[PDB]
Amino acid sequence: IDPFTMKKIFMMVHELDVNKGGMTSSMFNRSKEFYDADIPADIVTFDYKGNYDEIIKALKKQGKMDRRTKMYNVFEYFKQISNNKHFKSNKLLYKHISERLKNTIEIEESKGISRYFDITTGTYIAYIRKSKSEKVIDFFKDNKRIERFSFIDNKVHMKETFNVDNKVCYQVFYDEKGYPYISRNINANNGAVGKTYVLVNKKEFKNNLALCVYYLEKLIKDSKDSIMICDGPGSFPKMFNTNHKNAQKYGVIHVNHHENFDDTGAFKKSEKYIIENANKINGVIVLTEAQRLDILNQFDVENIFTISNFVKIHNAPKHFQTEKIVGHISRMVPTKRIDLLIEVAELVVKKDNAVKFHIYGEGSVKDKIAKMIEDKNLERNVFLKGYTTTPQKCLEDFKLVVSTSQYEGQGLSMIEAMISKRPVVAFDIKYGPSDFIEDNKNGYLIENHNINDMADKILQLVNNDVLAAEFGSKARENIIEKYSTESILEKWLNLFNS
Amino acid sequence: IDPFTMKKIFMMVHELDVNKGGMTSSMFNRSKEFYDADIPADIVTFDYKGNYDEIIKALKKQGKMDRRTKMYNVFEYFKQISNNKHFKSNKLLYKHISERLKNTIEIEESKGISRYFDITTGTYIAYIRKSKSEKVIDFFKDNKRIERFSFIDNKVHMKETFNVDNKVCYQVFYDEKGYPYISRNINANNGAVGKTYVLVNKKEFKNNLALCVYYLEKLIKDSKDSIMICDGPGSFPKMFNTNHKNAQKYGVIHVNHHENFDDTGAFKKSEKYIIENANKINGVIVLTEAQRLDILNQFDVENIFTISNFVKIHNAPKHFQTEKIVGHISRMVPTKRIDLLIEVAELVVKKDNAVKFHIYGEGSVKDKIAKMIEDKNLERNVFLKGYTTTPQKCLEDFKLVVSTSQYEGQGLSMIEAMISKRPVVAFDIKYGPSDFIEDNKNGYLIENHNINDMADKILQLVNNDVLAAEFGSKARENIIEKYSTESILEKWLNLFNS
Amino acid sequence: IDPFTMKKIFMMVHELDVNKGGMTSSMFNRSKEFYDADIPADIVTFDYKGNYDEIIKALKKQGKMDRRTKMYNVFEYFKQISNNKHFKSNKLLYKHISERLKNTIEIEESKGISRYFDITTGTYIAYIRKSKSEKVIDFFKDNKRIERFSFIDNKVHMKETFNVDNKVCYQVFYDEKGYPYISRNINANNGAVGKTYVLVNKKEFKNNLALCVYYLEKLIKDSKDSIMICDGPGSFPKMFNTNHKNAQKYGVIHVNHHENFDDTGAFKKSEKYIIENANKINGVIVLTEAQRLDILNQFDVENIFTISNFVKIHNAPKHFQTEKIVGHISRMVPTKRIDLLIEVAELVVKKDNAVKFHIYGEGSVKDKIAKMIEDKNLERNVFLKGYTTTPQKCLEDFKLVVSTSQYEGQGLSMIEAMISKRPVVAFDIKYGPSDFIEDNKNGYLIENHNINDMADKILQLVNNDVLAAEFGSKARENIIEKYSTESILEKWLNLFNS
């Protein structure tokens, strides 16, 4: 690959945030590898945040995002156009705000929260809340909130309008000199973005889709060296609909495409739309051959390719754990079936008592598990430890780990554990686990409903230190041979070259 | 009749419009005949239209309204009072509008539709739509429409106010120099007019009824030579409630007074109110003796008189049609039972295929007929040709015509067809057809449910050219002897003279 | 008692009003007796009225309130603080109002009611209603009322804000120079007072409870000579929650504490809260030993004391009535079971016809009694005479009187009648009647469901003039011996001294 290649990759997803994992981790690391191979791979997002600067800076400070990865955001782009049209700050905006606050007395609620009342009439005028570098000002009309101005570092970046139910129905974004550059309608019911007005260019759009199609045609040169990769399934139409004639388009599916918990044969509606149009773009990528194989029968398309996530080999713990500890790391999600896990930890501890179960995670499964834990009185064995910033020093504490998930794209959490020499006991589900857990040499695969069979193989190893240690080391080394950076990279480059 | 008579007739109805037929046609022609006999007969209306000038001009251009017939409208009257109180245009109104639009940028939607956004705050200010000589300006508040200004020739004539559901709850009417002369409350639910404020006279009224009672006492001199004729049943209370001591009052009923599709013996509520008060005014007029007869038993009143509509004899077609074509002209209305018609055209064409059925009309029966047409697969026989501006050159194309109506006042469409020498096959219903279709000499009457008996007599004549031609000529000439202008006029004059 | 004692009693209740009886009568007279014994006893209220001055003046003019009794009201207090901070009238408030009314025409509705419309646009601006010394101005926005300014003697005292449903959601109170001193949120659904802003002191409160707790700590010196008596059960938390360490606190229960019409054993929720905290204050007072006795078992507290209302002996009528008249005085309330009364007056008059039944009262039982009266056709015997300002000259007209009440605190109306030498026939209910009607010496007690037994003893006396006269005189004198001022007063003083 030409160190001076003019190839560039644009990887698309709705938003980035701190403490948001999932495919964005896969995007971050994938960007890192492309740059290492001298192909810049940046990220494109389509949502509004007044503090994206702080968010990206923090993602890089925490080592989650490679320093070379840029994020291109649609509102930032028009903000930058607006910044270069005015050469004088919008004082009138501040005057407008200041005028509405004159003739008021202040009544404090607490140190950064006060209300303001007209001193002639006693009418409720404003609510002001201040925290650190942020400030919100809420204006009232007939004692109902109508507007909120949001500030960062004493500069307005956003104004919101509220309807009779006190929900947002309109937004304005201001540039760094105080000028409005975009406004847009919000449907108060569901929060869907509607008509979008690009004020700085005197142009209207039907909605954010139309806005971003336009943005991408400005952002991404129409050359065969421009590569677009859409990871966010919700964002695929933005890519699909541009008028690029020469730039390449790929869509990546990160999850099982079958609808969750269905016997109809139902496919998730977005991922089905992406798959069905595979022959209208350069390619749809899935993480396993298993999934690629299922698709080629099910659908009449051919442009389906298998490319695994890159895998990064962190250093293993210095010490094998031997205390009968076994943990679970995950978001608290229905599809990871932690409900079965507690019903196996129930089983393990009726038979062997000194085993305990450490659970890290946050989500819609936590407080109906906590209640599930002591309904059957098990919280001196089963522990629910909340969120994990450092889920590698949690791996060191574990002898083995468990996965009761029914639906995965690849199961990276299971791979990541094997890297720390911590062997895995998990369901034989699609897709992922069947590949990198070799039954009886680095961890166990069970067939997916037999939580009883899970009892045996789990407490087997929680009292066999040497088979615990040897399998984890066979689990780490297996990963290294199976998922090499150079192998993945090559599959990418063959697609781009055509 | 004195060519210098001071008699004048005021004929009342809610509104006039282009493409609105029915009794207004009867009013138009009736006015024409009264003027010919040297008695002016003008029309009074009670609704608001900013473009009534254009509407009346067009009605006269199209030859629907006699050039001598004036329309007196209640809002026009107060508009004219306001016009003579101010001698300087209302610049402040335009300044008010212009002020709210300053400091905006424009964002086009299409060539005559743009939106306006405050350039300091980005707030949505206005929507402007322009077409030819008309313009509407919509102002927004918290991103919801609150007001609409309507323009004709760049002059405001109306302002409307909108509630939270974006429905009108208040209206203002402006005179030709821009001054508000009337405002009024609207009930957003049903559109009923409420409190009405006559600003130019500093006076309030309970509602449009009270307003128009007042108007009529100003418009119509209280002399025995002032004659009021109420045609619009909805407008009867306006007439009934004035304090005129000397002016004559008549009400005309144009329809069957029995409630439609009823077995109770139910009378339409308005027409019952008019009938019950017949002995409290000079007279209630119905179009047939049949109907007059039914009333005199049913009710304890005597002032019921029969006077037919005037009938105008247009020139007949030069040629008899002989192609097996037979048509239906009507609004698409439940009471004209076109449902039976298609179920007779079904019958005719199972027996004789080369017959086809041309249907002109628009209404609430059209798209459940179109579907009814091909559910039984008949659209190469039965044709639905939309609206008719020239329903006489449609008469020429026909050999005969059909009426499946169950409820009529007289059945003028059936008479009008006979004039074009096109004989009629229609139900023997009340009221009208029993009079001017002589069974077996100019057309057929069937008894009203036997659509099978209709099959026989219809396709009889669609293949008997000479009985088709002779009956139509017997149908035209019959009309001429039966309904003469001089005969009708005389019945009117005897009422007025008493 | 020291004529120079620094003892003072503060008696608490939500509001005072004219034509509002009940415990406020008991408070009025109780105040009178304390002052006579040289201990000032004033009243504290917690609601807003712009005309409290007129109301108190009228209560004293009518001899209902002792001239020495002051009323301390929470809003008056802050009004007075505001009055002493400004030394210039708030002209801007009047300018604000005047500005919104300029450029309008007036349209009269009647002599004190007019509407105002902008003369440039015709928009509805205001509604003004004037009566005597009061005026309200309503302002409109998009033809919906948003604000009402209330005036007394041409000075604003209140401004109200209206929501989309035209209900109050915010109030402002202005001082006598026109300055806003308090504003507060109203929940439009139920009318509950919320966040309260004491503008004159730049301070906020959670609600009226928090406001009044604060008020009472300012109003009532924290000394053992400050005595707080809470009569209004709704107002007990205001007293209970102050931080007074030294001032005494008593709560008085005026009614049966059992929930009305219940078989569960349910206690009225407020009175239960007061009773349960009896040992946390100086004492809970009930009107009878009977009720005190029921409580000491039912609850685990001891600070329950019995002290009767003071009783005032008005002069008796000069003449015994002997016409068979027998009356009922009461508010028309479910708990006084006038339904049974009419079903005894039914019984009395089937047997003796010349007896009639005079009923004075107003309430939620009147119009389902009127209908109940002639459904059984009895209004030439049973009479419903409306409200009574002079219920002593109604006592003179009566030979005896009746009470069918199931629930009482003491039954003062029954006592008051005996004073006029009018003996009572009433149910033996709790609490009260068992004490001061001695069965067979001054009136009759029946057991509470036997309305038939009531027939006998009633018409017995309506035809025994001498037993009617003698029992009433035994009824008057009994009261005098039983309920002496000095006896009551002494029970109070022993509590205060401890």
Q: How far apart are CA C317 and CA A59, in angstroms?
A: 95
DSSP B154: T
Q: How far apart are CA A454 and CA A427, in angstroms?
A: 9
C-alpha distance from B126 to closest chain A C-alpha (Å): 13
Residue C479: phi, psi to the nearest 5?
A: -55, -45
Nearest in space to B273 (alpha carbons), one of B251, B303, B293: B251
Chain A residue with CA closest to C162: the answer is A142
Q: How far apart are CA B290 and CA B304, in angstroms?
A: 12
CATH T-level assignment (fold) for domain C1-86+207-314+484-498:
Rossmann fold (3.40.50)
Q: How far apart are CA B196 and CA B207, in angstroms?
A: 5
Q: How far apart are CA A66 and CA A62, in angstroms?
A: 10
C-alpha distances (whole Å) from A92 to each of A95, A97, A177, B119 are 5, 8, 11, 10
User: Is the CB of B197 less than 8 angstroms away from the CB of C123?
Assistant: no
Radius of gyration of chain B measured on its C-alpha atoms = 26
C-alpha distance from B211 to closest chain C C-alpha (Å): 15
Q: How far apart are CA A288 and CA B360, in angstroms?
A: 65
Nearest in space to A325 (alpha carbons), one of A462, A417, A475, A418: A462
Would you state the structure tokens that stand for residue B45, as one six-digit string?
A: 């209306």
C-alpha distance from A106 to closest chain C C-alpha (Å): 7
Do residues A257 and A272 touch, judged by C-beta distance below 8 A?
Answer: yes
Residue B195 CB contacts under 8 Å (≥ 6 apart), including other chains: B184, B185, B204, B205, B206, B207
Chain A residue with CA closest to C185: the answer is A143
Burial bucket for residue C339 (CB in 10 Å: 0-12, 13-18, 19+): middle
Do residues C328 and C360 touch, judged by C-beta distance below 8 A?
Answer: yes
Q: Which residues of B are less than 8 Å from A162 in CB distance?
A: 142
Do residues C57 and C229 touch, judged by C-beta distance below 8 A?
Answer: no
Residue B139: phi, psi to the nearest 5?
A: -100, 145
Report the interhelical angle of B451-461 vs B338-351 (nearest 10°): 60
Resolution attained, angstroms: 2.4
Q: How far apart are CA B401 and CA B419, in angstroms?
A: 12
Radius of gyration of chain A measured on its C-alpha atoms = 26
Do residues C226 and C10 touch, judged by C-beta distance below 8 A?
Answer: yes
Q: Does A142 touch chain B (CB under 8 A)?
A: no
C-alpha distances (whole Å) from C112 to each of A402, B194, B202, C133, C135 are 83, 22, 16, 12, 9
Find how far residue A355's CA is from the centre of its chain.
Answer: 34
Would you state the structure tokens that stand for residue A335, as one six-digit string?
A: 């599809």
Q: How far apart are CA B104 and CA B115, in angstroms?
A: 9
Do residues C323 and C290 touch, judged by C-beta distance below 8 A?
Answer: no
Angle CA A323–A325–A331, to nearest 5: 155
Round to the nearest angstrom and report the end-to-end CA distance of chain B.
15
Do residues B325 and B356 touch, judged by C-beta distance below 8 A?
Answer: yes
Do residues C240 and C282 touch, judged by C-beta distance below 8 A?
Answer: no
C-alpha distance from A171 to closest chain C C-alpha (Å): 23
Q: How far apart are CA C453 and CA C43, in angstroms?
A: 44
C-alpha distance from B192 to closest chain A C-alpha (Å): 25
User: Is the CB of B122 less than 8 angstroms away from the CB of A92?
Assistant: no
Nearest in space to B356 (alpha carbons), one of B376, B340, B338, B380: B380
Q: Where are the beta strands (DSSP E) in C208-276?
A: 226-230, 248-253
Amino acid at residue number C47: D
C-alpha distances (whole Å) from B218 to each of A474, B77, B175, B461, C109 are 106, 10, 19, 58, 22
Nearest in space to A80 (alpha carbons), one of A154, A175, A152, A157: A175
* DSSP helix, strand, coil percent of chain B (3-state; round to 5): 35, 25, 40
Residue of C106, C109, C142, C146 to mutate for B, most B C-beta atoms under 10 A: C142
Burial bucket for residue C35 (CB in 10 Å: 0-12, 13-18, 19+): middle
Chain A residue with CA closest to B119: the answer is A180
Do residues A459 and A355 touch, judged by C-beta distance below 8 A?
Answer: yes
Q: How far apart are CA A413 and CA A422, in angstroms?
A: 11
Breaks (C-N over 2.5 A) in chain B follow: none
Q: Which residues of C are less than 8 Å from B169 in CB distance?
A: 142-144
Beta-carbon count within 10 A of B150 CB: 19
Breaks (C-N over 2.5 A) in chain C follow: none
- DSSP assignment of B431-453 equals SSHHHH--BTTTEEEE-TT-HHH
Residue B476 CB contacts under 8 Å (≥ 6 apart), including other chains: B316, B418, B419, B420, B421
CB pairs A-B closer than 8 Å: 60
Would you state the structure tokens that stand for residue C275, as one six-digit string?
A: 């009773």
User: Is the CB of A143 less than 8 angstroms away from the CB of C169?
Assistant: yes
User: Which listed CATH number (2.60.40.10, 3.40.50.2000, 3.90.1010.10, 3.90.1150.10) goes with A315-483?
Assistant: 3.40.50.2000
Point out which residues pair with C369 in neighbouring strands.
Answer: none
Q: How far apart are CA B304 and CA C52, in angstroms?
A: 67
C19 phi-psi bin (left φ>0, alpha ψ -120 to 50, beta other): left
User: Is the CB of C169 less than 8 angstroms away from the CB of A142?
Assistant: yes
Burial bucket for residue B315 (CB in 10 Å: 0-12, 13-18, 19+): exposed
User: Is the CB of C199 less than 8 angstroms away from the CB of A107?
Assistant: yes
Q: 3-class SS at B269?
A: helix
Q: How far apart are CA A257 and CA A235, in angstroms?
A: 16
Looking at chain A, which subunits does it touch, using at least 3 CB pairs closer than 8 Å as the criterion?
B, C
Nearest in space to C317 (alpha carbons), one of C236, C394, C232, C420: C420
User: Is the CB of A106 less than 8 angstroms away from the CB of C202?
Assistant: yes
CA-CA-CA-CA torsion sign (C76, C77, C81, C82): negative
Amino acid at residue number A293: L
Q: How far apart are CA B41 and CA B56, in angstroms?
A: 15
DSSP C279: G
Residue B369: phi, psi to the nearest 5?
A: -110, -40
User: Is the CB of B143 less than 8 angstroms away from the CB of A169?
Assistant: yes
- A residues 50-89 lying closer than 8 A (beta carbon) to B: none
Q: Does A202 touch chain B (CB under 8 A)?
A: yes
Q: How far apart are CA B126 and CA A383, in angstroms?
A: 60
Residue B153: phi, psi to the nearest 5?
A: 55, 45
Q: Which residue among A107, A120, A144 sits closest to C203, beta carbon to beta carbon?
A: A107
Radius of gyration of chain C measured on its C-alpha atoms = 26
Residue carrying structure tokens 């608490």 = C12
Burial bucket for residue A245 (CB in 10 Å: 0-12, 13-18, 19+): exposed
Residue C185 CB contacts under 8 Å (≥ 6 apart), including other chains: A143, C169, C170, C193, C194, C195, C196
Nearest in space to A401 (alpha carbons), one of A325, A457, A452, A307: A325
CA-CA-CA-CA torsion sign (B166, B170, B173, B179): negative
Q: State the structure-solving technique.
A: X-ray
Q: Does C110 touch chain B (CB under 8 A)?
A: no
Do residues A135 and A129 touch, judged by C-beta distance below 8 A?
Answer: yes
Angle CA A39–A40–A46, to nearest 5: 140
Point out which residues pair with C284 in neighbouring strands.
Answer: C251, C304
Q: Does C114 touch chain B (CB under 8 A)?
A: no
Chain C residue with CA closest to B204: the answer is C107
Q: Where are the beta strands (DSSP E) in B224-371?
A: 226-230, 248-253, 283-286, 304-306, 325-329, 356-360
Do residues B23 and B232 touch, judged by C-beta distance below 8 A?
Answer: yes
- A residues 144-163 lying closer than 8 A (beta carbon) to C: 144
Nearest in space to C333 (alpha carbons), one of C255, C229, C238: C255
Nearest in space to B430 (alpha carbons), one of B261, B286, B290, B268: B290
Q: Which residues of B are less than 8 Å from A187 in CB distance?
A: none
CA-CA-CA-CA torsion sign (C235, C240, C242, C247): positive
Point out which residues pair with A328 in neighbouring strands.
Answer: A359
Q: How far apart are CA C126 and CA C115, in angstroms?
A: 6
Beta strands C180-186; C193-198: pairing state: antiparallel
Residue carrying structure tokens 């069974």 = B439
Beta-carbon count within 10 A of B341 CB: 22
- DSSP assignment of A258-319 equals BPTT-SS-PBPHHHHHHHHTGGGSSEEEES-HHHHHHHHHHSS---EEE-PPP---PPPPSS
Q: Which residues of B are less than 8 Å from A140 in CB distance?
A: none
Region(s) of chain A under CATH 3.40.50.2000:
1-86+207-314+484-498, 315-483
Q: Which residue among B90, B164, B183 sits closest to C120, beta carbon to beta carbon?
A: B90
C-alpha distances (whole Å) from A479 to each of A407, A430, A484, C14, C56 are 21, 18, 8, 77, 90
Q: Does A204 touch chain B (CB under 8 A)?
A: yes
Q: How far apart are CA B255 and CA B410, in angstroms?
A: 8
Do residues C268 and C298 touch, judged by C-beta distance below 8 A?
Answer: no
User: Is the CB of C143 less than 8 angstroms away from the CB of B96?
Assistant: no
Q: How far apart are CA C43 and CA C76, in angstroms?
A: 13
Do residues A188 and A169 touch, judged by C-beta distance below 8 A?
Answer: yes
Q: How far apart are CA C361 and CA B204, in angstroms?
A: 41
Residue C176 CB contacts under 8 Å (≥ 6 apart), including other chains: C79, C83, C155
Do residues C122 and B199 touch, judged by C-beta distance below 8 A?
Answer: yes
